[PDB]
Design a protein around this ligand. Structure first.
Ligand SMILES: *[C@@H]1O[C@H](CO)[C@@H](O[C@@H]2O[C@H](CO)[C@@H](O[C@@H]3O[C@H](CO[C@H]4O[C@H](CO)[C@@H](O)[C@H](O[C@H]5O[C@H](CO)[C@@H](O)[C@H](O)[C@@H]5O[C@H]5O[C@H](CO)[C@@H](O)[C@H](O)[C@@H]5O)[C@@H]4O)[C@@H](O)[C@H](O[C@H]4O[C@H](CO)[C@@H](O)[C@H](O)[C@@H]4O[C@H]4O[C@H](CO)[C@@H](O)[C@H](O)[C@@H]4O)[C@@H]3O)[C@H](O)[C@H]2NC(C)=O)[C@H](O)[C@H]1NC(C)=O
Ligand code: XGI
Ligand code: CA
Ligand code: CA
Ligand code: K
Ligand code: NA
Ligand code: ZN
Length: 805
């Protein structure tokens, strides 16, 4: 209840929200229904429009007007944005030449350059090229400042999750806004676009930029604009705030446009009707810049022009209906559209079985335009699992499609030609980034990056310490002229042991056989030196990974590969090797087929055993260093050491064998050699983070050999591919993956065919950043390069997306 008979005179767009039942004059008052009676009269003035004209110049201030053309407007900071253009012979900002901004050029009293965040809903990355003729203010920002070709949103590629990610540097699973619509079973409440529950603060976790600012003494304008405030009024209000005195003036501001999303849904991303919404947004940018220029702030302020997500062509007829798959369709609730989330319509229905749902949704139609997942089996790059608001069953929808429960839902609600929400690597979902100001670089193009990284940079631009977040602080230093953040590499927590030969063969009772009884001092010293680390500079190109947690492990050297062997997990944390462009593939000889050899540096008690695998009828084993790529027949015996073995389901061995026997050599031919680091990942609680011993849910039968949930590989070469991977002078090139370790290939509908028709497509789906693998393993890679650490941080956040340009 609001007592809406107090006043808004001299309080219009107050920055301090006052508690009801005092009447509010701030941005959320409309969205609460609590504005003072005169809010619209005093704070939403529109008389005479938004532009000066020749006749208005020098007018007598008249306070009914929307903005002013009187002589005193500048020192009041409430001129129409085109006042000096119309009345004082000045040029529009867009008509002025680009001039480098080397230092903030700010009025006295500014303690730091302000930041303005200009966010644009549904501004797809390709609009920067395709709409350039109709967006000259935006093109100037882009060409004069720092820009990326595109920015990667988070999943799902919806508005709230993305804007809230921008604000917090957090994945949706950690900030809590995991969708535009949500059910939280702990609160037993629902969050929707429509309605009031979304305003409750228990939905919104982490710490958003405006709180981070406030807690550190930096004031903020509003981030949420009521839909009934026109864009011109948002701009004027920001300009007004910027005219405030030092002790009251915010240092961070946000503008938000509903366009071009709003049109894009009606007309498709490139509908002919889209030209006008792009013109209008551009005009709004020009208003701001002319406005800043009048106030002498246009070479003082940092401006970020950023979108939340793009827009794809989607129509009614490209809908999949769960009712075509499931007989039980009324026993489930679906969150529908460009993704799907399924839970039971009622939790008193004990008949509901997720596994049978999954099975009924799996590879049933030959061109099925969605794929069902248990949420822990989703590509780890999505980071979309560790929140009780994300339902266990998820449907990843093909680009251009929708999923719905029943046909009645899609014709009792065709209306739309555009939607978004799909997998965040889809080109159509990509969005924009331009930074313009003194703190940003001048006419600089930077590579694509993820929006989770911006919170850190915004904090850097404002002199704030970021709250803990999923950004990699430093990885965007190359966007910035100054205020870079210079991190140190984390400190190694466990130092390795380097065991020599300590055990005799007969001390091992493993159930393991190897037909290796096949007997000189030229190559006896040669092999001892391989075991003491003589080829290590070849196979460990970027130093050994640092183990960032407390554990017990051994460095094991070999001719063809080096490993960090865990005595706790009984396998390598990592195995590292280099495959030159000229390496040859050889087959596994028959004397070695089911050969596994004891490793005489590692006790029987810290080794795997073959008998466990023989007993375990579901689980087989593979190798981390692939025997197919051994350098010589004498070296191939090393690949069969028990310390190179890892548990693998036979269904996953098909994938693994193809990667090892075919793809690694293909990559080495394409990239002029590759270095490979492979290993296991254990993420049984799907938090994106390395499990401890006590989190492991599955062991090889009758043993303490833990079963990985995933296998990773990091494939590094020279960005200049005329240099070989092992002799690279400059910047590196990387691709990686995190392959789910699954007992079937249900995920791949074409898996009954030969591996050349499906394995690579699976691997691309599970592409990863090095940084994802770091979180998952507690390892820190690229410790010893000749590159700057920020450049390495950028490499570690790179994601190879396998989309065309
Ligand atoms: C992305 O970056 C983020 C931020 O860096 C990373 O997330 C962090 O991960 C940390 C490690 O998991 C985690 O640390 C835990 O914090 C617990 C205290 O948490 C509260 O306070 C913090 C600080 O202000 C706040 O951030 C939290 O907010 C969460 O919770 C509410 C909802 O409940 C949400 O609104 C909010 O969005 C956020 O939710 C997210 O986090 C929680 C987990 O905290 C998830 O469940 C949600 O799904 C969502 O993802 C909280 O308000 C603290 O209690 C934990 O400590 C336990 O473990 C240690 C082990 O050493 C032990 O010493 C402690 O005693 C404690 O154990 C006891 O409790 C156990 C569980 O109940 C019990 O089993 C034991 O028996 C023990 O008695 C822990 O330190 C940190 O909270 C989050 N922060 C955020 C914002 O998410 C994230 O990991 C990064 N992602 C990747 C892939 O890198
Ligand atoms: C999205 N929006 C809405 C919105 O949707 N309105 C008004 C009517 C409805 C439709 O449904 C309700 C209003 N104003 C915004 C901008 O929000 C932001 C912008 C930015 Cl730049 C950042 C950042 N960084 C963060 C936000 C949040 C505050 C979302 C977190
Ligand atoms: Ca949006
Ligand atoms: Ca985990
Ligand atoms: K077996
Ligand atoms: Na299959
Ligand atoms: Zn939209």
């Amino acid at each position: 209840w609001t007592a809406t008979s107090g006043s808004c005179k001299g309080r219009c767009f107050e920055l301090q929200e006052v508690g009801p039942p005092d009447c509010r004059c701030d941005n959320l008052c409309k969205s609460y229904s609590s504005c003072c009676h005169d809010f619209d009269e005093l704070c939403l003035k529109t008389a005479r429009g938004w532009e000066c004209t020749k006749d208005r110049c020098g007018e007598v201030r008249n306070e009914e007007n929307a903005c002013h053309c009187s002589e005193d407007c500048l020192s009041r900071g409430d001129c129409c944005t085109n006042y000096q253009v119309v009345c004082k012979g000045e040029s529009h900002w867009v008509d002025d030449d680009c001039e480098e901004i080397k230092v903030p050029e700010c009025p006295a009293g500014f303690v730091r350059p302000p930041l303005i965040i200009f966010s644009v809903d549904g501004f797809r990355a390709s609009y920067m090229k395709k709409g350039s003729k109709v967006m000259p203010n935006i093109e100037k920002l882009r060409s004069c400042g720092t820009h990326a070709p595109y920015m990667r949103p988070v999943y799902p590629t919806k508005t709230f999750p993305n804007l809230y990610t921008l604000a917090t540097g957090l994945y949706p699973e950690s900030h809590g806004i995991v969708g535009n619509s949500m059910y939280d079973p702990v609160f037993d409440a629902s969050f929707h676009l429509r309605g009031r529950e979304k305003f409750n603060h228990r939905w919104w976790g982490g710490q958003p930029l405006w709180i981070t600012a406030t807690k550190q003494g930096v004031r903020a304008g509003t981030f949420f604009w009521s839909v009934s405030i026109p864009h011109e009024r948002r701009i004027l209000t920001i300009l007004q705030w910027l005219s405030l005195p030092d002790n009251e003036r915010p240092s961070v501001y946000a503008f938000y446009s509903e366009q071009p999303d709003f049109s894009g849904h009606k007309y498709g991303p490139f509908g002919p009707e889209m030209t006008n919404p792009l013109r209008e947004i551009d005009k709004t940018v020009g208003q701001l810049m002319d406005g800043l220029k009048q106030l002498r702030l246009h070479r003082c302020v940092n401006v970020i022009f950023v979108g939340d997500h793009g827009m794809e062509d989607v129509t009614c007829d490209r809908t999949e209906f769960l009712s075509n798959y499931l007989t039980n369709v009324d026993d489930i609730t679906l969150v529908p559209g460009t993704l799907g989330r399924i839970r039971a319509k009622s939790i008193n229905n004990s008949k509901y079985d997720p596994k049978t749902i999954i099975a009924a949704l799996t590879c049933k139609k030959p061109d099925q335009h969605f794929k069902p997942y248990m949420k822990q089996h989703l590509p780890k790059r999505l980071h979309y699992a560790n929140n009780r608001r994300i339902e266990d069953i998820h449907l990843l929808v093909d680009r251009r499609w929708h999923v719905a429960r029943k046909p009645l839902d899609v014709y009792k609600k065709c209306f739309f030609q555009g939607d978004h929400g799909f997998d965040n690597k889809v080109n159509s979902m990509q969005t924009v980034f331009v930074g313009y100001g003194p703190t940003f670089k001048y006419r600089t193009k930077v590579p694509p990056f993820e929006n989770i990284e911006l919170y850190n940079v915004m904090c850097d631009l404002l002199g704030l310490k970021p709250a803990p977040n999923n950004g990699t602080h430093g990885s965007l230093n190359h966007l910035l002229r100054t205020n870079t953040f210079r991190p140190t590499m984390p400190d190694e927590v466990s130092r390795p042991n380097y065991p020599g030969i300590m055990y005799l063969q007969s001390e091992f009772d493993l159930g393991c056989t190897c037909d290796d009884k096949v007997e000189n001092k030229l190559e006896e010293l040669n092999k001892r030196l391989h075991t003491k680390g003589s080829t290590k500079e070849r196979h460990l190109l970027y130093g050994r990974p640092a183990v960032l947690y407390r554990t017990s492990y051994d460095i094991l050297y070999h001719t063809d590969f080096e490993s960090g062997y865990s005595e706790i997990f009984l396998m390598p944390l990592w195995t590292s090797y280099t495959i030159s462009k000229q390496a040859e593939v050889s087959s596994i000889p028959e004397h070695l087929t089911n050969c596994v050899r004891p490793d005489v540096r590692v006790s029987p008690g810290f080794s795997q055993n073959c008998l466990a695998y023989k007993n375990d009828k579901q689980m087989s084993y593979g190798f981390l260093f692939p025997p197919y790529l051994s350098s010589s027949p004498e070296a191939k015996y090393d690949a069969f050491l028990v310390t190179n073995m890892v548990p693998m389901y036979p269904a996953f061995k098909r994938v693994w064998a193809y990667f090892q026997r075919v793809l690694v050599k293909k990559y080495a031919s394409e990239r002029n050699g590759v270095n490979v680091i492979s290993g296991p990942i254990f993420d049984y609680n799907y938090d994106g983070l390395r499990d401890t011993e006590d989190e492991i849910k599955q062991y090889v039968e009758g043993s303490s050999i833990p079963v990985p949930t995933h296998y990773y590989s990091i494939i590094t070469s020279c960005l200049d591919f005329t240099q070989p991977a092992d002799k690279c002078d400059g910047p590196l090139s990387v691709s990686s993956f995190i392959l789910p370790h699954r007992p079937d290939n249900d995920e791949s509908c074409n898996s009954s065919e030969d591996e050349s028709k499906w394995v690579e497509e699976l691997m691309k789906m599970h592409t990863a950043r090095v940084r994802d693998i770091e979180h998952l393993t507690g390892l820190d890679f690229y410790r010893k390069t000749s590159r700057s650490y920020s450049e390495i941080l950028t490499l570690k956040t790179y994601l190879h997306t396998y989309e065309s340009e």
